[PDB]
Amino acid sequence: VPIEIRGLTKHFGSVRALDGLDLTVREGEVHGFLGPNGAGKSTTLRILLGLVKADGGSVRLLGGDPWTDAVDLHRHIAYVPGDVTLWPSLTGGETIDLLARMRGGIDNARRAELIERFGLDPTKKARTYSKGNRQKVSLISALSSHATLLLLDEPSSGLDPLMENVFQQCIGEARQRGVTVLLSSHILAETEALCEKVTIIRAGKTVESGS
Amino acid sequence: VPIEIRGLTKHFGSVRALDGLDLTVREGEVHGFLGPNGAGKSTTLRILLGLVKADGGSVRLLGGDPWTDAVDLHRHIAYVPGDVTLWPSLTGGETIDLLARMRGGIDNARRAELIERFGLDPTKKARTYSKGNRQKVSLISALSSHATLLLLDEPSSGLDPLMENVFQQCIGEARQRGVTVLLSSHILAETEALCEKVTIIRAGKTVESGS
Amino acid sequence: RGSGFTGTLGLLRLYLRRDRVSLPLWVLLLSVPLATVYIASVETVYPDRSARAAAAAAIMASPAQRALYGPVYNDSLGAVGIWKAGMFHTLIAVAVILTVIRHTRADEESGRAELIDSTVVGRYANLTGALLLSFGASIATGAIGALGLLATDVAPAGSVAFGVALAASGMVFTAVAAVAAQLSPSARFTRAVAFAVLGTAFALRAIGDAGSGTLSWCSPLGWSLQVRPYAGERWWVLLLSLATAAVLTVLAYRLRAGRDVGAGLIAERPGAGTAGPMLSEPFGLAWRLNRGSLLLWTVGLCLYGLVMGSVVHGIGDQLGDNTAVRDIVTRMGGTGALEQAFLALAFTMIGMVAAAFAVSLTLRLHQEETGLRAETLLAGAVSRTHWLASHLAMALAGSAVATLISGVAAGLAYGMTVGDVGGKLPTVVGTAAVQLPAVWLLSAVTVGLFGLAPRFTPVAWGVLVGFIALYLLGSLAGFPQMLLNLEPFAHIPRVGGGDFTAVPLLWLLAIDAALITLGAMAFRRRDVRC
C-alpha cells in the first residue's frame, strides 16, 4: 500500500481547518483525487512530501512516515507541481536532468523518445519557453525517472489535445510496469479516461470514494 | 460578421511558415478554435489584435482591419491571455478596475456578483495569488465589460470543476445578450459543452470546419 | 479618434503607481544630499579658500581621484564641493536605465504588455509612457538638486548648471535604455547592453580625465562634467547631450516601429541539451544561479579596493589638520597614525558593501522559496539542510573572496604607491579579512529570519541600514557609548602595532554561528509555505 491516510487533520492559522478526517488508500493503480481548490488537495500533497507537518491522524507513505523519512523515501518518487516554475538561465535539457538526478535518476532511452514525441527543443533557455513547453519539461523529467510512485498535480495544463493524448498513452504505458499514479486533475475527462476508483473531497473530509 | 479571415499567410523567420491559407468566419455565436500548439492559433489571435502584421490574405475584424484601426476597434473587444503575469504590487480589485479604465468601461452590477460567485478576495496583492486565483482576475475583468466580442485563449486554466461550471454558466448567460465568443480551448469537453461550429487547423490551414 | 499614442497618459499613470515608492526615493535620495551632505561637508572640512586651494591641488595631483570623480578647475566653495557629487551622473544614469528597462521590457517578457496592448492603447503608448516617466524623473531630480543648491552660499549660476547637467545625464541614458529595450526579448540582455554602454562611457570619461582630457569628450558622462558648474559654465555643451538624446529617442521609435510586441531583433544563444557533470545537486544549481552576481560584485569590490590603495598615501599630507578630520579619523577609525587609521574606514565600508552582498545572496534563499522553486527542490531527494547549505555556502564564500580580493587590490595599490608592496600588503589583507566576522553577520541574520519568520526575511536590509545608521549617526555625534555596541562594525579590531585583542572577532563569530544554527534548526521543523 503505497499511500494510506486515515484521520488526517490540520489547522493552518487555526483560522483554516484545511483538514479534518481525510482518508485515502492506493495499491498499485491510477487514482483520481477530486475536489475544489480550497478543499485541501494541495495540503495533502504537501503533507505527503515532507514540506508540511500534520496535526493528527496517520500518514504512511511507502511504509515510512513522510516527515522524518523525507530523504530516504523521495528517491522512489516523482512529483509534478501544479504550477511548474523553472530557472530562466537554464536550457530545457539541463532542467530535465537536474530534476531527475536529484530524485531517482534518469533513463536515457525513455528520455530520448519522450523528447522526440512531446516535440521539445532542449537547447532553449527556459525563459523563452511558452506554457505549453514549460509543462513538457516537468512531464519529461518525471516520466523518465525511476519512480515507483508519481504524484501529478494538474499534469496537463497548457497542452493541446494531441499532447494530451500522448500524455495519456504514456501514463497507460507506465501503469503496466507496476508504477502507482496519483492524478489530481481538475479535468474530469482525462480522469474518466485514465483513472478508476476516484475519491471526492468537499471541505476536509472525503465525501465519496470508489470505482 | 465580427470575424472573417480567408487567405491568411505569415512567415516569421521567413523559414517558419506559421500561416498558409487560413480561414475563419464568426457571426454572433460561440466558435471553437482547435489545433495543436504550433499550428498557428496564437499567431491568428495576435494578428487579430494589432500586435502582428500579416503577409497576405484578408483579415476583417468588426468591419475595419486590425492593423490600422487597432485603437478604435479595441473598445468593443475583451481578451483573455493564454498566460499573463499580473503586476505583483497591485491588488485584485485594482487590477480589475485598471484593465477597465483602459478597455473603456466596466459594469459594477455584474462585477459585484462575479466577484461574489468566483469567490475572489479583491484585497490581497496579486503576488500572493495562487494559480487558480490568478485566472479569476482576468475572467472577471473580461466578463464584466462592454464587449461585443470576447477573445478567450485557454480561459479556464487552473480552475476546479465547480469554477469551470460557473464559467460555463456565465458564458451561456453572455451568449444571449448578443455577445460573440471565441474559445480556443485545448479542452474538448468544455468545447463540446459550449461551442457549435468548431474549426480544426493542422499546420497553417484549416483541415476541418462545421457544426 | 484613436492614434498610435492613445493611452499614453493612462499607461504613464499605471507606471507611476507601479513604482510610487521607489521613484520618489531615488529622486529625493539622489537630489537632496547635494547641498545638505556634500557642500555642507566641504564647509565643515575646508572652511577657508586656503584649504580649498590645497584640496584642489591635491585632487589635480592624483590620477586616481581625478579619474574616479574628475578634475577641479578652481578653489571656489561650489566647485570643490560639487567635484565629488560627480558620481551622481552615473547614479542617475543607472536609475533611469533600470526604470526604462523595467517599464518597457520585463513587462513584455512577462506577458503583461499583450494584455495591455489588447486594450485601447496605441502602438507607441508603452514606449512613450516609460520615456516620459524617466525624462520627468530626471528633470525632477535635477530641479530638486538645483533648488537645494540654491539654498547655500555658492554660485547661483553653477547650481542651475549642475542641476541641468544632472538632468541631461539622466535623459541621455533614458534614451540609450529606450534603444536597448528594443534589441532583445530578454530583459536581462537589454539591461546588460545598456549597462555596458554606461560602463564604456564611464571608462572613456575616466581615461580622459586622468590624462590629456581629449578622450573624455567622447563620452556622454563627461559632457556633464565639462559643463564646468562653478568653474565657468559652458552651457553650449548641454545641447551636445540634447542632440544625442533626440537621436537615440528617434532611433528607439524607429526600432519599435519595425518589430512585434513579443520579441525583437536579436535571437538568444541556445545553450546545452544535457546538464553537464556539475548540475546534479543543489550546490551545482545554486552556483549557476549565483555566479553572475558573484562576478559582478567581486569585480566591483576589487575596483573599489583598488581605488583606496592609491588614495591612502597622499591622504596624510592633505586633510584639515586639527579639524574634525584628524579628530574623526581617530575616534571612529581607531587612534594612531593617519594612514593606518584610514584603512580602517575604507575597509569598514568595503565590509558594509560585502555585508549587502551577503544579504543579497542569502535573500536568494527566500526568493527561491517564495518563487515556488524550493518545493520543487525539496520534493526530490534533497535534505532540508543540504538545501540552505548551498545558498549559505556561496553567500559566505562569495563575501569572503570579494572582501579578500578587495584587500589584495588595495594592498597592491598601496604598496606600489609607497615604494614596496611586501611591507604593506599583509597589513591591508589583514584589515580586509578582519571584517569577515561582521560581514558574515547579516548572513546569519537573514538565515535566522528565514526559518523563524520567512515573510520578515527582507527586513534584514533594514537591519543592515540600521547598523549603518548606528555606525554613522552615533559615532559622528555625542551619542552614548552604551547603544553604540549594538552594531558589529565598531567592534572590529585594527591590525598594526598593537591593540589587536581578537576577542570581539570570536564573539562575532560565535554570534554568527549561533544565528545560523537557529535558522537551520527552525527551518528543519517549519512548513514550507506557498
Side-chain angles (χ1 to χ4, degrees):
Chain A
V1 177
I3 295 180
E4 183 178 2
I5 307 167
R6 293 182 183 174
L8 196 49
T9 308
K10 173 148 199 66
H11 299 73
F12 267 107
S14 178
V15 297
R16 293 182 183 174
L18 188 147
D19 274 335
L21 197 52
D22 195 281
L23 282 72
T24 305
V25 177
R26 205 159 297 154
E27 305 190 357
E29 63 203 10
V30 187
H31 204 88
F33 194 44
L34 309 163
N37 262 323
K41 308 198 315 185
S42 188
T43 307
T44 315
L45 281 189
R46 289 162 44 203
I47 282 184
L48 274 182
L49 320 164
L51 307 178
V52 161
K53 183 175 174 66
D55 297 348
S58 172
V59 190
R60 253 194 317 185
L61 183 65
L62 289 155
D65 181 65
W67 185 245
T68 65
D69 301 331
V71 179
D72 293 330
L73 293 176
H74 281 184
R75 297 208 142 255
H76 320 284
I77 283 170
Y79 174 59
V80 174
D83 205 33
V84 291
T85 321
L86 311 162
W87 296 270
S89 47
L90 276 69
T91 60
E94 304 181 326
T95 318
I96 283 176
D97 288 269
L98 188 23
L99 287 179
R101 273 182 195 166
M102 302 184 311
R103 288 204 226 96
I106 186 167
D107 185 336
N108 296 113
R110 205 151 56 232
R111 168 204 201 270
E113 79 183 12
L114 274 182
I115 285 181
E116 156 192 300
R117 67 183 65 202
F118 286 165
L120 189 76
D121 188 24
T123 46
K124 183 190 183 69
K125 301 204 158 317
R127 45 170 90 258
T128 70
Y129 279 147
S130 65
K131 192 171 51 118
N133 283 260
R134 261 187 275 121
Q135 195 76 28
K136 294 180 191 170
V137 174
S138 303
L139 280 177
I140 294 160
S141 175
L143 291 169
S144 69
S145 208
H146 144 84
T148 55
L149 179 74
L150 294 150
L151 302 180
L152 320 168
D153 184 72
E154 307 184 47
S156 78
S157 173
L159 265 59
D160 61 356
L162 295 174
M163 297 309 174
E164 171 69 28
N165 201 56
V166 177
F167 160 71
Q168 292 188 13
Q169 281 175 322
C170 276
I171 289 296
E173 287 187 312
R175 197 256 322 284
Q176 70 196 5
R177 309 190 318 249
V179 178
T180 316
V181 193
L182 177 63
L183 195 63
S184 177
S185 182
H186 295 105
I187 297 187
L188 316 173
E190 80 175 0
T191 298
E192 202 174 6
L194 286 171
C195 318
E196 83 280 4
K197 293 201 189 89
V198 301
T199 179
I200 310 159
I201 78 173
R202 198 191 291 154
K205 294 181 176 67
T206 78
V207 297
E208 185 66 26
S209 160
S211 52
Chain B
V1 177
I3 295 180
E4 168 169 319
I5 307 167
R6 293 182 183 174
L8 196 49
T9 308
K10 173 148 199 66
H11 299 73
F12 267 107
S14 185
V15 297
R16 329 149 189 177
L18 261 295
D19 274 335
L21 197 52
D22 195 281
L23 283 72
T24 305
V25 177
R26 205 159 297 154
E27 318 220 18
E29 63 203 11
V30 187
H31 204 88
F33 194 44
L34 309 163
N37 269 323
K41 308 198 315 185
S42 188
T43 307
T44 315
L45 281 189
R46 298 165 69 239
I47 282 184
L48 274 182
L49 320 164
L51 275 66
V52 161
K53 183 175 174 66
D55 296 348
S58 172
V59 190
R60 179 66 65 192
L61 183 65
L62 289 155
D65 168 63
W67 186 245
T68 65
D69 301 331
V71 179
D72 293 330
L73 293 176
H74 281 184
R75 293 182 183 174
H76 320 284
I77 283 170
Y79 174 59
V80 174
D83 181 65
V84 52
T85 311
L86 296 167
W87 301 270
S89 47
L90 276 69
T91 68
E94 279 185 321
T95 297
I96 286 178
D97 286 333
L98 160 67
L99 287 167
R101 72 142 171 280
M102 292 177 72
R103 229 173 289 266
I106 201 181
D107 185 336
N108 295 113
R110 205 151 56 232
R111 168 204 201 270
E113 79 183 12
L114 274 181
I115 285 181
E116 156 192 300
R117 67 183 65 202
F118 286 165
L120 189 76
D121 188 24
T123 52
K124 294 187 287 184
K125 301 204 158 317
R127 46 177 55 116
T128 70
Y129 279 147
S130 57
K131 183 178 179 180
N133 283 259
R134 262 187 275 121
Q135 195 76 28
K136 294 180 191 170
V137 174
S138 303
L139 280 177
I140 294 160
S141 175
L143 290 169
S144 69
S145 278
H146 327 299
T148 55
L149 179 74
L150 294 150
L151 302 180
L152 320 168
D153 184 71
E154 307 184 47
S156 78
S157 173
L159 265 59
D160 60 357
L162 289 92
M163 297 309 174
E164 171 69 28
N165 201 56
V166 177
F167 160 71
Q168 292 188 13
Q169 281 175 322
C170 276
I171 289 296
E173 287 187 312
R175 182 182 65 198
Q176 70 196 5
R177 309 190 318 249
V179 179
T180 317
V181 193
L182 170 69
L183 195 63
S184 177
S185 178
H186 300 291
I187 297 187
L188 317 173
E190 80 176 0
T191 298
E192 202 174 6
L194 286 171
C195 318
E196 295 85 357
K197 294 201 189 89
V198 300
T199 179
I200 310 159
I201 78 173
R202 198 191 291 154
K205 294 181 176 67
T206 78
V207 297
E208 185 66 26
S209 160
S211 52
Chain C
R1 53 177 63 87
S3 65
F5 293 91
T6 308
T8 295
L9 293 197
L11 277 189
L12 175 60
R13 160 181 173 184
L14 161 62
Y15 299 158
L16 187 61
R17 196 278 181 200
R18 199 195 165 202
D19 57 17
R20 62 183 181 194
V21 175
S22 78
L23 191 85
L25 262 67
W26 74 258
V27 160
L28 286 158
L29 192 151
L30 207 70
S31 56
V32 302
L34 273 183
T36 61
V37 160
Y38 280 99
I39 284 186
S41 78
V42 154
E43 293 179 353
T44 300
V45 170
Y46 309 113
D48 190 72
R49 184 176 176 87
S50 57
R52 295 195 294 257
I59 285 146
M60 294 299 291
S62 79
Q65 270 163 302
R66 202 170 66 181
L68 179 63
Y69 292 128
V72 180
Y73 310 100
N74 58 2
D75 63 358
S76 43
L77 169 58
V80 166
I82 210 68
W83 162 80
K84 213 212 306 192
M87 269 276 273
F88 275 19
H89 305 300
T90 314
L91 293 187
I92 188 75
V94 165
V96 300
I97 286 167
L98 280 176
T99 292
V100 179
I101 302 287
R102 147 173 176 108
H103 282 305
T104 57
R105 186 71 68 190
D107 190 73
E108 311 194 336
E109 193 188 32
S110 70
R112 298 190 275 265
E114 66 183 1
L115 170 70
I116 287 300
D117 198 327
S118 68
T119 59
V120 292
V121 310
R123 185 176 179 83
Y124 310 114
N126 177 20
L127 185 65
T128 304
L131 276 177
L132 189 64
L133 181 78
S134 296
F135 285 152
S138 305
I139 290 177
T141 184
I144 294 179
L147 194 42
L149 287 175
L150 287 166
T152 50
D153 291 23
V154 304
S159 313
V160 175
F162 179 87
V164 175
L166 193 60
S169 172
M171 293 177 70
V172 173
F173 288 92
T174 290
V176 302
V179 175
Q182 325 297 320
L183 287 185
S184 195
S186 187
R188 183 180 63 83
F189 190 93
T190 60
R191 264 181 218 111
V193 169
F195 283 135
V197 167
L198 175 58
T200 189
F202 192 90
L204 288 182
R205 194 270 298 162
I207 297 169
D209 273 345
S212 70
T214 299
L215 204 77
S216 162
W217 277 96
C218 283
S219 166
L221 311 177
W223 290 339
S224 292
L225 292 192
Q226 295 298 289
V227 180
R228 292 174 187 262
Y230 315 109
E233 299 89 11
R234 301 188 296 211
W235 299 90
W236 64 265
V237 67
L238 290 167
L239 67 86
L240 199 40
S241 294
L242 188 153
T244 298
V247 162
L248 285 158
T249 296
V250 165
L251 176 68
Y253 276 96
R254 281 314 298 172
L255 288 192
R256 172 69 190 92
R259 78 161 169 90
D260 308 307
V261 180
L265 185 61
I266 292 172
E268 293 179 354
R269 270 305 92 71
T274 44
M278 320 324 297
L279 276 173
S280 53
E281 82 168 282
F283 275 92
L285 161 78
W287 167 249
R288 287 278 315 248
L289 264 50
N290 289 337
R291 51 183 202 188
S293 290
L294 281 71
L295 181 59
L296 161 70
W297 281 87
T298 295
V299 166
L301 275 173
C302 180
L303 284 189
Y304 187 34
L306 188 57
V307 159
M308 305 284 185
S310 66
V311 185
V312 168
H313 180 215
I315 303 301
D317 284 8
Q318 294 300 320
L319 256 188
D321 303 306
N322 289 337
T323 299
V325 278
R326 182 61 190 85
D327 181 40
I328 255 62
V329 204
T330 49
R331 44 183 206 186
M332 54 104 60
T335 45
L338 183 62
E339 293 83 3
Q340 303 145 46
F342 165 66
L343 278 300
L345 264 319
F347 279 104
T348 305
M349 90 161 295
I350 297 165
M352 278 154 172
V353 176
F357 180 33
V359 176
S360 302
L361 271 65
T362 311
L363 275 181
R364 186 139 312 138
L365 203 59
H366 177 70
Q367 291 174 306
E368 202 93 354
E369 176 193 86
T370 192
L372 295 166
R373 289 178 304 266
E375 313 92 17
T376 302
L377 282 150
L378 299 172
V382 163
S383 188
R384 185 182 295 276
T385 300
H386 182 59
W387 197 82
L388 188 147
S390 53
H391 288 284
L392 268 174
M394 282 73 75
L396 301 194
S399 299
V401 303
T403 306
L404 266 291
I405 297 169
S406 177
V408 172
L412 268 187
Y414 185 27
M416 293 177 70
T417 289
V418 292
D420 53 326
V421 64
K424 308 288 169 288
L425 183 62
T427 68
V428 178
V429 172
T431 301
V434 72
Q435 316 293 327
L436 285 185
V439 296
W440 283 344
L441 193 147
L442 295 169
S443 314
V445 174
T446 318
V447 168
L449 289 166
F450 179 88
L452 293 151
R455 66 184 182 277
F456 318 129
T457 309
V459 304
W461 281 127
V463 162
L464 167 58
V465 164
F467 285 163
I468 291 184
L470 183 63
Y471 187 74
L472 266 47
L473 310 175
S475 309
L476 275 66
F479 189 78
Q481 202 48 251
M482 65 182 179
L483 272 72
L484 288 175
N485 299 4
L486 310 184
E487 61 86 20
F489 297 111
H491 295 268
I492 302 296
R494 275 69 174 174
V495 287
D499 283 330
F500 177 26
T501 186
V503 168
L505 290 200
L506 289 182
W507 272 89
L508 268 170
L509 275 178
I511 283 294
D512 298 345
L515 271 171
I516 284 167
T517 295
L518 290 197
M521 293 177 70
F523 181 45
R524 275 199 290 111
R525 67 184 68 188
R526 199 273 310 288
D527 300 1
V528 178
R529 293 185 307 272
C530 281

